[PDB]
Amino acid sequence: MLKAWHLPVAPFIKEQQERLMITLWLSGDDLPPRVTLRAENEELSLPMHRLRQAPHPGVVAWRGEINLVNGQPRRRYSFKLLWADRQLWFTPQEFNRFPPARLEQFAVDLPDSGPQWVADQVFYQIFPDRFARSYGGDLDGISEKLPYLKQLGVTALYLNPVFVRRVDPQFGGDAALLRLRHNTQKEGMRLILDGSVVRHWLKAPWSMDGWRLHIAGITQAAKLERPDAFVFGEHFGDARQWLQADVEDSAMNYRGFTFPLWGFLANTDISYDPQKIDAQTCMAWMDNYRAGLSHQQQLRMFNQLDSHDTARFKSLLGKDVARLPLAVVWLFSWPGVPCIYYGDEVGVDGNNKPFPWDPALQDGDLLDLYKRMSKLRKAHQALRYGGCQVIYAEDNVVVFVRVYKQQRVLVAINRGEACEVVIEDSPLLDVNGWQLKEGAGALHDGVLTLPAISASVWFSR
Template sequence: MYEEIALMSATLAFHQAIPGYLTRDGDRIVVKLAVGGVQPEIVRLRTEPDNEEALTDMTRVEAHDGWAWYQAEIEIPEPDVQMRYLFKLVWSDRLLWYGALGLDEGVPTLNQMFRYLPDHQVPDWVSRQVFYQIFPDRFAEGDPNTTPETDAYDYLHGLTAQRRSWGDAPLAHQGPVEFFGGDLPGIEQRLDYLADELGVTALYLNPVFTSRSNHKYDTVDYYTVDPHLGGNEALVSLSDRLHEKGMKLMLDAVINHTSVYHPWFQRALQGDAECRARYVFQGDDNEQPHYASWKGHDSLPVLDFANPANVETFITGEDSVIKHWLRPPYNIDGWRMDVIHMLGEGAGARNNHHHVRGLRHAIKSHNPDAYLLGEHFFEATPWLQGDQEDGAMNYYGFGHPVRAFLAGLDIAYDPIRLDAAGLARWLAKARAAIPFAQQQAQLNQLDSHDTRRLITMLNDDAALFQAAIGLLMTYIGAPCLYYGDEIAMPGGDDPDCRRSFPWDRDDWSSAAFSATQRWIRYRRASEALQTGALIDLYAEGDVYVFARVLAGEQCLVAVNRGEGRDVVVADGLTPLAGQWQCLEGGGELGRADLNLSLRLPARSTVLWRRQAD
C-alpha cells in the first residue's frame, strides 16, 4: 500500500505481492520496492527467518520519473513457515520503515508486516470471479412438484411445514418451515440470466442437503441433496451446466452441528453410545439428556470433533463429506464452511485451528484448486495466515465498515459515526493483518441471508446504493452479490431479507440493475480490479479515494457519500504513460503539479482507468 509522511519527508513507497514486486524463482524469492520522491541512501529488506531480525541490502535496479526501484533476493523459508518482512529506508540523519500500513518512523508491529507463505497459495481464479449468493428456496422455482405441502411433516415446537405462494412476505413466526418452492432446477433455468445478462461468474449456494427447514443449516443427511430442491440429480445437472458456461460452484458445509432429526442424534436419544459420543452431552445416561447446541438453539446439537469418527466422517475419510462433493459427478469448486471458527472438541472450540488445518489438507489434497472459505462475522485474522482458510466472508474487513460509513449502522444496527478517514483506517488494518493472497480471496458482500438488505439500511437511497455496488466491484477481494442486490431488492431482519425473487421486471429497480451490469463489466474487463494491489490515496469527510494497480494498468476509484465536491489528491501512483479515462460516474480528473484534482458528483462512485501505451 502507499502512505505519504508529509511532515517527515517527501518520500513515497510502494510494495505488494503483485507480479514484478514479489516473485518466486525456484528456491528463492525476488522482492522489489518502489520509492518515489526523496531517495534514501540505503534500502534494506528486513525478514525474520528464525524469529530474529535479518537485514538484506537492496540494490537499485531502475530509476525514472522521480521513482526508483530496489531489489533483493532471499531464500524461501522452510515449508509451512510464513515469511514476514519490512523495508528499512535510511538517510544520513533519519530512517523510515515501510510495512503493510505504510511509512512509519517506528518499527511496525508483527501484524503490520508484509507476510507470505510460499507453499500455501489460494486458487488464482477466486479474485477473478463475481460471485452470486442464492438462498435456494427463494430464488426460482423449476419443479413445482418438489415443494413440500402444508403440514407435510413436523418440525419443532409445534411447527409444521407450510407451503407459501411466490411473492408472499415471509412470516417471522413461521421462520424455518415456510417453503416458497425455489429449487436447483429453477437456478439452472435462470443461468442465462445470471451469466449472460447480469454477468456473474460463480454461484455460492446456501445449504442444499436434506433438512426439514428451508435454510437447511440443520442437516439430516449429508450425502443427499434435499429432494425438495431436486435431489442429487439436480445438483449434477446444475454443476454440469455451470461448468459448460465457464462458471464456478461453491456449496455451504455445516459440520459444526447437525439437525436433531439426524439419525445419529435420534439414536443417541435412545441410548446408542456410539452415536451419543458424536455429540456433546452433559450428564450420565440415566439423566434427562442435556446437550450442547449452537448458540443455545435446541434444533442444532453440536458435533464433538474430539471423536475420531467425526473427523473421519466429515474431513479425513476417503469418502468424507468434504471430499465426496468435490468428486465427479458433482465437481464443486469450493466450500463455504459455516461457523468454521466454532468447530472443535467438547462444548467449546478447543483445537479449532488443528481441525481447520486438517480440513484444508483434506480439500487441497483432493483438489488443490478448490476454494476454502470460512464464515466469520467478526475478525478472522488467525485463520487467514495461509495455512488454514483461503479467505473469509469479509464482514469484518468490508461489510461492517462499509455499512457503517454509508448507512451509519454497526453490525447490531446500532448508530455509528464513521467518516472516510475512519473507513480507510478500518479497511487498511484489516488488509494489513493478512497476506496479500488472502486479501485477494476475501469474499466481500454488502448484505447476506443473515443481515438486513443494504438498500433498506440506506432508507431506499438509490444513488448511495449504486455507489455501494461500485465500491463492491472495485475493492480488493472477490465481490459477491446476494440474490436481488442487482435490482435493489429490499428486506429487513431475517426472514424478511430472504424474500422470494420478483421475476416480474416491473418490480425491479431498472437503474440499479443497469448500474450493476456496468460495474460487473468493468470488474471483468480490468486485470487491475481483479488482481491488483490497493493503494489508499485520500480519505477525508465523505470522500474515500483509492487505486488498484498493476505494472501496466491503474484504476482510480473515488467514493463520495455526500454532496458533489472537488478534492485534491496527492498523486502517489508510480508513473504510467497511458491517459486516464472516466468509465463510470461522470467525474472530472485533472493534474496539477504532483496532485490529482477530482470533481465528484454527489453520492457516487467514480471509476477512472489508464493502461500502459
C-alpha cells in the same frame, strides 16, 4: 516530507528463478542513506541497494531480494530505513517508529497453493427456496435461470442452505443437484455448497468446487480430494487468526469490507448501533484489516454488502438509498471476489422476498450498473490481481488506485455534496492519461471534480 511507496505486486515485485526481487520507492529531502529489506522462521536483514534510474520524477528506488529456495511459502517482509542516528519502518500501514507486528508486514505467497481460480470469479449467493421454481423455488429453477446469471456476469454459485449428507427434498434432492452440477459445468460456472462428508461432495460425480465452513483437518482433507478446492468461513468478526494460520482459504469479509461500508455509507453496524464514520477512519479500518493478510489472501477474500444473516443493504441505507450505486462500484473494485446476494442486482429490499422475475418490479438502472462493473472487472487484470493503495480519504471522499504491472485503475467515491478534491502528485498516478469508464467525474490537472453521491472509475491507457 519523507514519502514512500510499495505494494506486494508488480511493478514492485518480480520472481527471477528462485529470487523475489523487491523494490521500494522513496521521496523527500533527507533520504535514508541505507535501507535494509527485513524478511523471514529466522528473521534476516537483507541489504538493499539504490538504483541508478529513477522510476518516476523525484523518486529514488531501492532493491533487495529474498532467496525462495529456503523458507515457508508465505514471504513476509518490511522495510527498515536507516539514518546515522535513527530508523523508520515502512509497512502496509505507512511508516512505523517502532517495529511492526510480524503479521502486519507485507506478504506474498510464493509458491501460491491457494485456489487461483477464485480471483477470476464473480459469485452469486442463492437461497434456493426464493430464487426460481422450475414458496417452492428449487435447484432446477436455478438451472433454468443460468442464462440470466451469465448475462449478469456470474461465474460461480454459493448455495445456502442445500442439505437437510442429503439434499433437502424441497429443492429436488440429490438428483436435482446432479443436474445443477452438470449444468454449471457446461456453463463454465463454479459451484460452492454450504455445509469424509467434505470429501464426498468434492469427489465425482458431485465434484463441487468447495465448501463454506484444528479445523484445518477439514481444509487438508478437502485439498487432498481436490487440490483447487475453495474452503472459506463465515465470520462476522475478526477472522484473521484463522486466515493467518491457513486453516481457511478465505472468509466472508464482514470485518474488512462489509461493516466499514455499513458505517461509512449507512451509519450503522451489525448490532444496528449508530456509526458516524468518516472516510479517513473507514480506510484506516479497511487498510488495517488487509495488513494481516498476504496479497493472495486479500484477492480471495469474500466481499459482500449483505447475505442471508443480514438485512438488505438497500434497506439499511434508509433515506440515503441514493448511495447504493457507490457500494456496487466499491464491491467490484476493492481487492477480493465480489459476492452478490440474489436479488441485490434488481433492487430487493427488506430487513432480517422472492426474486422479482417480472422486469417492471426490478431496478433496471441498478441491474445495468452490475453488468457494467462485471464487464469492467473481467476486462481489467488490475481489478482482479492488482494491489491497492488508498490515495485520498477525507470526510466524504475515498480515492484509491489498483496497481498491476503498467495498469492503473482509479476509483473515486463521494458520499456527500458535490465537491472538488486536490489529488497530490503521486508516482502511482503518473500515467499517459486516464479514460473515464464509469460514473461522471472529472480528472483535470491534479483535481478530481465529483458529483454529489457519485462513484467513478478511471483506467490507465
